């Protein structure tokens, strides 16, 4: 029916008018009298050497010391950051891995990729070896991202244009999040783990209610595929990173974009995005083989974490906020501080 | 000034390091191939000659080959094709009998997309033109002019064989960085593995010249 298509357009117009109405002053205008952060001089403290292929993903533990990393070699390595020691090395059934996660408790790790399977690994056994606990199957497409809520719950994004919540014990999808019209690329839990946001190749980000299983809000602005997403520490905003070589800041309550982080010299897309503990810095990996640091309130470049030889694939900040880990296609993680 | 337990934890790290290096050496002594094709255009039959992803193993003349078929992966290629940046070669399959089945043009559209992909600048392509027997029976029935109206030559197998070959090789733009090895395979063959071996040998030589600095 044509009416339905028209009625949709009328509602889209209404939403646009509503979000235009509450737009009164820009973040730039408010953040004019604050002083700049200065020049952010970070140096490489550690270089974690071991992977023999392009590193695709990494994730910190909650302890803010251990971190897991994933590579196309077909290995998860768990590092001790302080000592540059390898704690576990896990051989993977599929070498094609595009994501990995570390449980908050620190008892489990997850990974997945072109196998279309999220594999859970029990780290703490009596036998003293890391074994596969569960292989979660159901997704039709490549597993793009995964993040634990609990020891028994994990949420995954996949190229099949869906996100799914799992009950690890039973190994079944509890609820499926449907809405996107492109390969869902990145995922970010809210602090309270009651909501999460997902960025897809449809150049759109969506807010999900974990419990009810529905799209609460949809965010548009990016011109190209959103490759990275991360939640602001407050939990009332989030930052995306796309192929149009811009990062953007969205707030949930006003339901619109606030700030854009663009520089004319920068033309390559963003791989990865993360915030500082305060949320005053917004770190972003790029395809030009260097990470940049943005004043999240002013939108001025504050520093450059240049060091890697190849694409900065993944980027993570500790919970204590003490350090930054940057994995790359040069098969090295560098820990900055 | 390490403590007793710290030193033992280092010893463990070293053993992990050792076993990682060994697994790497083993991986380096293996040929990795990517298999692409317009639907089922003789990808199955050449696999016999030798779900997200399917992996095949075959050894020939003391050289192990790993062949990855990504047919089941029904998603935007651009978002994962960069994973296979570093494969030794790309085997491409085209059904020569699917010229009148448009599909040939779709195969051509897929071919040039892979050939002129930023990731596969210096990645050789081992094109197989499958189903030549049926094509020889098809050309005498239905002409090639349906597929290629610019084809002015006589509707014979020998001429059309060379013509279609030329079409695909013309799609290649980077003629210096990489090479294309073409072969007319069929269902009743036993020398297709040999043709891959010859082609891969050439790719190894080139990589050997890169390491020495000659190239």
């Amino acid at each position: 029916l044509d009416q339905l298509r028209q009625e949709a357009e009328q509602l889209k117009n209404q939403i646009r008018d509503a979000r235009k109405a509450c737009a009164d002053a820009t973040l730039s205008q408010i953040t004019n009298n604050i002083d700049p952060v200065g020049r952010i001089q970070m140096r490489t403290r550690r270089t974690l050497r071991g992977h023999l292929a392009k590193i695709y993903a990494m994730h910190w533990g909650t302890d803010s010391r251990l971190l897991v990393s994933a590579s196309q070699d077909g290995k998860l390595i768990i590092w001790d950051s302080y000592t540059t020691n390898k704690v576990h090395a896990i051989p993977l059934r599929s070498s094609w891995v595009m994501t990995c996660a570390y449980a908050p408790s620190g008892n489990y790790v997850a990974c997945g990729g072109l196998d279309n399977i999220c594999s859970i690994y029990n780290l703490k056994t009596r036998e003293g070896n890391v074994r596969v606990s569960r292989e979660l199957a159901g997704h039709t497409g490549y597993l793009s991202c995964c993040r634990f809520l609990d020891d028994n719950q994990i949420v995954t994004s996949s190229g099949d244009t869906t996100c799914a919540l799992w009950d690890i014990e039973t190994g079944q999808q509890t609820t499926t999040f449907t809405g996107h019209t492109g390969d869902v690329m990145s995922l970010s839990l809210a602090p309270d783990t009651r909501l999460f946001v997902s960025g897809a190749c449809d150049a759109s980000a969506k807010l999900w209610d974990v419990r009810e299983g529905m799209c609460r809000q949809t965010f548009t602005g990016h011109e190209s595929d959103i490759n990275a997403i991360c939640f602001f520490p407050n939990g009332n905003a989030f930052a995306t990173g796309s192929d149009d070589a811009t990062c953007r800041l969205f707030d949930l309550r006003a339901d619109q974009e606030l700030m854009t982080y663009s520089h004319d010299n920068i033309i390559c897309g963003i791989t990865s995005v993360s915030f500082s503990k305060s949320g005053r810095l917004l770190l972003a990996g790029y395809d030009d083989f260097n990470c940049n640091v943005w004043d999240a309130l002013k939108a001025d470049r504050a520093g450059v974490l240049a060091g890697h030889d190849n694409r900065v694939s993944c980027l993570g900040v500790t919970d204590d906020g003490m350090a930054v880990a940057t994995g790359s296609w040069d098969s090295f993680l560098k820990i900055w501080n | 000034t390490l403590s007793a337990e710290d030193k033992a934890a280092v010893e463990r790290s070293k053993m992990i390091d050792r076993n990682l290096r060994e697994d790497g050496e083993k991986a380096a002594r293996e040929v990795k191939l990517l298999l692409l094709g317009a639907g089922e255009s003789g990808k199955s039959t050449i696999v016999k000659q030798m779900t997200g992803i399917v992996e095949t193993h075959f050894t020939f003349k003391d050289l192990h080959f790993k062949m990855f078929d990504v047919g089941g992966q029904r998603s935007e290629r651009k978002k994962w094709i960069h994973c296979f940046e570093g494969v030794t070669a790309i085997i491409f399959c085209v059904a020569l009998s699917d010229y009148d089945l448009n599909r040939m043009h779709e195969s051509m559209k897929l071919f040039d997309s892979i050939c002129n992909n930023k990731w596969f600048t210096d990645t050789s392509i081992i094109l197989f033109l499958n189903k030549k027997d049926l094509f020889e029976e098809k050309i005498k029935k239905s002409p090639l002019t349906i597929c290629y109206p610019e084809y002015a030559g006589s509707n014979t197998y020998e001429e059309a064989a060379a013509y279609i070959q030329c079409q695909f090789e013309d799609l290649n733009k980077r003629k210096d960085t990489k090479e294309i090895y073409t072969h007319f395979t069929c269902a009743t063959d036993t020398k297709n593995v040999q043709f891959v071996f010859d082609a891969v040998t050439d790719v190894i030589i080139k990589n050997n010249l890169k390491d020495c600095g000659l190239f």
């Epitope: 010391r65 009596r126 003293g128 070896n129 | 403590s3 007793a4 033992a8 934890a9 463990r12």
Partner: single-chain antibody, 233 residues
């Protein structure tokens, strides 16, 4: 199901030789440093020898150095102790203990059942002042272990362990690195202390808690145990 069965014990004539064999089943024996720990008929525990994963590091006690030799056969999952020139001192039950060392591991976790050997006729001194203390089921008790040297390291790990040997059983790990409680141990057990002072506080005394409580340092080799405090009543 983790188990370590030792064999090769009996009556040996003095100045002889005997080999012990500790067969392993139900864990990755390859990736576990192994220890030997003796116990004389009516005395506490005494560490003997260690061999790391990879057989790349070996240590011995000063009483056995030269005489005893430790070796492992990873394919067959068996540990060996080739003893030579046996003395009337060596008469002891020999236990076979596993230990894994990485960040946040639990060393000295599982002990074997042991084998009885009978021979016919700079070290850190751990001190438990209390030899025995009577207790009432339901109450709380505290065990005290002192040290000659501060077991706190610069990294910030106080390497002090606690063990329990119930009557007619093998020692069981309770607490590792002063505070961290071991798996399969009730929360009633708790451990705290300083550099040299240590205290194991047991609450809600159970009838199964009766036994001897040892304290062991793992700051530096040789690894030294205390005298042991026996709970009773």
């Amino acid at each position: 199901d983790v188990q370590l069965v030792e064999s090769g014990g009996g009556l040996v004539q003095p100045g002889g030789s005997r080999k012990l064999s500790c067969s392993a089943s139900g864990f990755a024996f390859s990736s576990f440093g192994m220890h030997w720990v003796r116990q004389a008929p009516e005395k506490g525990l005494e560490w003997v020898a260690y061999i790391s994963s990879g057989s790349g590091t070996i240590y011995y006690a000063d009483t056995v150095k030269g005489r005893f030799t430790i070796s492992r056969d990873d394919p067959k999952n068996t540990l060996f102790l080739q003893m030579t020139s046996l003395r009337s001192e060596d008469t002891a039950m020999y236990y076979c203990v596993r230990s894994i060392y990485y960040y946040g591991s639990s060393p000295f976790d599982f002990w074997g059942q042991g084998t009885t050997l009978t021979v016919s006729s700079s070290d850190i001194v751990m001190t438990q002042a209390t030899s025995s203390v009577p207790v009432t089921p339901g109450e709380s008790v505290s065990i005290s272990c002192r040290s000659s040297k501060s077991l706190l390291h610069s990294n910030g790990n106080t390497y002090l362990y606690w063990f329990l040997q119930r009557p007619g059983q093998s020692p069981q790990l309770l607490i590792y690195r002063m505070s961290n409680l071991a798996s399969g141990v009730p929360d009633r057990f708790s451990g705290s202390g300083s550099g040299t002072a240590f205290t194991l506080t047991i609450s809600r005394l159970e009838a199964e808690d009766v036994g001897v409580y040892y304290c062991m340092q793992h700051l530096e080799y040789p690894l030294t145990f205390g005298a042991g405090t026996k709970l009773e009543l």
